[PDB]
Amino acid sequence: GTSPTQIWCNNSQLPVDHILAGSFETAMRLLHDQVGVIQFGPYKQLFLQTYARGRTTYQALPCLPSMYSYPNRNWKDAGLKNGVPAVGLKLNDLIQRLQLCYQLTTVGKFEEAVEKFRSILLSVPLLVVDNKQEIAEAQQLITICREYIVGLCMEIERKKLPKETLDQQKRICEMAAYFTHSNLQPVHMILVLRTALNLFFKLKNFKTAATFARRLLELGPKPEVAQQTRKILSACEKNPTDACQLNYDMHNPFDICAASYRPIYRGKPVEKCPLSGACYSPEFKGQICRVTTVTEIGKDVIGLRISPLQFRL
Amino acid sequence: DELFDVKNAFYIGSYQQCINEAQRVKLSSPEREVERDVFLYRAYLAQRKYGVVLDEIKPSSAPELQAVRMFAEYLASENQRDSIVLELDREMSRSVDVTNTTFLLMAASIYFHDQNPDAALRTLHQGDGLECMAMTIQILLKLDRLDLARKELKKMQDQDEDATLTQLATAWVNLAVGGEKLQEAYYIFQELADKCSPTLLLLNGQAACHSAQGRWETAEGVLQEALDKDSGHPETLINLIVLSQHLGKPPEVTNRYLSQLKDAHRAHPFIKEYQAKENDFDRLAMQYAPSA
Closest Cβ opposite residue B281 in set A24, A60, A79 = A24
Do residues B258 and B242 lie in contact, with contact meaning Cβ atoms separated by under 8 Å? no
Helices and strands counted in chain B (H then E): 17, 0
Do residues A237 and A210 lie in contact, with contact meaning Cβ atoms separated by under 8 Å? yes
From B177, B206, B106, B100, select the one nearest A75 (Cα to Cα): B177
Among B281, B283, B291, most A C-beta atoms within 10 A, so best to mutate, is: B281
What is the rounded distance in angstroms from the CA atom of residue B161 to the CA atom of residue A164?
A: 89
What is the rounded distance in angstroms from the CA atom of residue B152 to the CA atom of residue B129?
A: 12
What are the residues whose beta carbons fall under 8 Å from the beta carbon of A266, sequence distance 6 or more?
Answer: A252, A253
Interchain CB contact of A85 with B (< 8 Å): no
* Partners of A85 in beta bridges: A72
Do residues A34 and A15 lie in contact, with contact meaning Cβ atoms separated by under 8 Å? yes
The 3-state DSSP class for residue B84 equals: helix
Interchain CB contact of A245 with B (< 8 Å): no
**What is the CA A103 to chain-centroid distance, rounded?**
16
From A66, A192, A52, A46, select the one nearest A120 (Cα to Cα): A46
What is the rounded distance in angstroms from the CA atom of residue A26 to the CA atom of residue A32?
A: 10
What is the rounded distance in angstroms from the CA atom of residue B7 to the CA atom of residue B30?
A: 17
With b for 16 or more beta-carbon neighbours within 10 A and e for fewer, the A254-290 pattern comes to bbbbbbebebbeeeeebbbbbbbbbbbbeebeebbbb
Q: Give how far A56 is from chain B: nearest CA, Å.
A: 5
**Interface touch A65/B142, C-beta < 8 Å:** yes
What is the rounded distance in angstroms from the CA atom of residue A177 to the CA atom of residue A198?
A: 11
Q: Give how far A38 is from chain B: nearest CA, Å.
A: 6
The 3-state DSSP class for residue B2 equals: coil
**Interface touch A78/B179, C-beta < 8 Å:** yes
Interchain CB contact of A92 with B (< 8 Å): no
Interface of A with B in 16-75 (CB under 8 A): 22, 24-25, 28, 32, 37-41, 44, 47-49, 51-67, 69, 71-72, 75
From A37, A91, A239, A69, select the one nearest B189 (Cα to Cα): A69
Do residues A225 and A190 lie in contact, with contact meaning Cβ atoms separated by under 8 Å? yes
State residue A72 phi and psi, 5-degree precision. -120, 145
Strand A67-69, strand A56-58: pairing? antiparallel
Q: What is the DSSP letter of B214?
A: S
CB pairs under 8 A between A and B: 155
What is the rounded distance in angstroms from the CA atom of residue B210 to the CA atom of residue A160?
A: 55
Q: For chain A, give the DSSP string.
A: ---HHHHHHHH---HHHHHHHT-HHHHHHHHHHHS-----GGGHHHHHHHHHHT-EEE-SSTTSPPEEE--BTTTTT--STT--B-----HHHHHHHHHHHHHHHHHT-HHHHHHHHHHHHHHGGG----SHHHHHHHHHHHHHHHHHHHHHHHHHHHHHS-SSSHHHHHHHHHHHHHHHHS---HHHHHHHHHHHHHHHHHHTBHHHHHHHHHHHHHH---HHHHHHHHHHHHHHHHS--BSS--S--SSS---BBTTT--B--TTS--EE-TTT--EE-GGGTTSBPTTTSSSBSS--------SGGG---
How many residues are given for chain A? 313
What is the rounded distance in angstroms from the CA atom of residue A163 to the CA atom of residue A161?
A: 7
How many residues are given for chain B? 292
What is the rounded distance in angstroms from the CA atom of residue B71 to the CA atom of residue B107?
A: 7
What is the rounded distance in angstroms from the CA atom of residue A94 to the CA atom of residue A174?
A: 33
Do residues A24 and B280 lie in contact, with contact meaning Cβ atoms separated by under 8 Å? yes
Q: Which residues of A touch B13 (CB under 8 A)?
A: 59, 62
From A125, A132, A121, select the one nearest A98 (Cα to Cα): A121
The 3-state DSSP class for residue B60 equals: coil
What is the rounded distance in angstroms from the CA atom of residue B217 to the CA atom of residue B244?
A: 10
Do residues B59 and B98 lie in contact, with contact meaning Cβ atoms separated by under 8 Å? no
* Partners of A242 in beta bridges: A205
Q: Which residues of A touch B69 (CB under 8 A)?
A: none
* CA quadruple B166, B171, B177, B178: dihedral, nearest 10: 170
From A184, A182, A199, select the one nearest A257 (Cα to Cα): A182
Integer CA distances (angstroms), B172 to A140, B212, B226, B232, in order:
44, 13, 20, 24
What is the rounded distance in angstroms from the CA atom of residue A155 to the CA atom of residue A111?
A: 10
Beta strands in chain B (DSSP E): none
From B223, B245, B255, select the one nearest A54 (Cα to Cα): B245
Do residues B235 and A57 lie in contact, with contact meaning Cβ atoms separated by under 8 Å? yes
State residue A280 phi and psi, 5-degree precision. -140, 155
What is the rounded distance in angstroms from the CA atom of residue A191 to the CA atom of residue B31?
A: 87
Determine which helix (DSSP H) or strand (DSSP E) holds B95, and give its type and residue range. Answer: none
* Partners of A69 in beta bridges: A56
The amino acid present at A31, given as its one-letter code, is L
Do residues B202 and B192 lie in contact, with contact meaning Cβ atoms separated by under 8 Å? yes
Q: Give how far A312 is from chain B: nearest CA, Å.
A: 27
What is the rounded distance in angstroms from the CA atom of residue A307 to the CA atom of residue A124?
A: 11
From B205, B182, B181, B211, select the one nearest B193 (Cα to Cα): B205
What is the rounded distance in angstroms from the CA atom of residue B269 to the CA atom of residue B279?
A: 15
Q: Check the CA dihedral A190-A194-A199-A204 and report its sign.
A: positive
Long-range CB contacts (within 8 A, 24+) of B164-167: B164/B8, B164/B11, B164/B12, B164/B192, B165/B11, B165/B130, B165/B131, B165/B134, B166/B130, B166/B134, B167/B192
State residue A309 phi and psi, 5-degree precision. -60, -35
Closest Cβ opposite residue A63 in set B42, B146, B242 = B42
Q: Check the CA dihedral B138-B141-B146-B148 and report its sign.
A: negative
The amino acid present at B64, given as its one-letter code, is E
The amino acid present at A262, given as its one-letter code, is R
What is the rounded distance in angstroms from the CA atom of residue B31 to the CA atom of residue B37?
A: 10
What is the rounded distance in angstroms from the CA atom of residue A88 to the CA atom of residue A93?
A: 10
Cβ–Cβ contacts within 10 Å for residue A301, how many?
Answer: 18
Cβ–Cβ contacts within 10 Å for residue B251, how many?
Answer: 12
Q: Give how far A21 is from chain B: nearest CA, Å.
A: 11
Q: If you measure CA to CA, which chain B residue comes closest to A59? A: B201
Considering only CA atoms, give the Rg of chain B: 21
Q: Is A123 left (phi over 0), alpha (psi -120 to 50) or beta?
A: alpha
The two most distant CA atoms of chain A are separated, in Å, by: 88
State residue A205 phi and psi, 5-degree precision. -95, 75
Integer CA distances (angstroms), B290 to A37, A58, A293, B280, in order:
11, 42, 13, 17
Among A8, A33, A69, A123, most B C-beta atoms within 10 A, so best to mutate, is: A69
What is the rounded distance in angstroms from the CA atom of residue A224 to the CA atom of residue B125?
A: 86
Do residues B240 and B223 lie in contact, with contact meaning Cβ atoms separated by under 8 Å? yes
Do residues B179 and B187 lie in contact, with contact meaning Cβ atoms separated by under 8 Å? no
Integer CA distances (angstroms), A260 to A144, A175, A180, A257, B23, in order:
20, 10, 17, 5, 79
What is the rounded distance in angstroms from the CA atom of residue A176 to the CA atom of residue A154?
A: 8
State residue A57 phi and psi, 5-degree precision. -145, 145
CA angle at A303 for the pair A301 and A304, rounded to the nearest 5°: 135
What is the rounded distance in angstroms from the CA atom of residue A127 to the CA atom of residue A32?
A: 16
From A16, A22, A65, A38, select the one nearest B279 (Cα to Cα): A22
Q: Which residues of B touch A97 (CB under 8 A)?
A: none
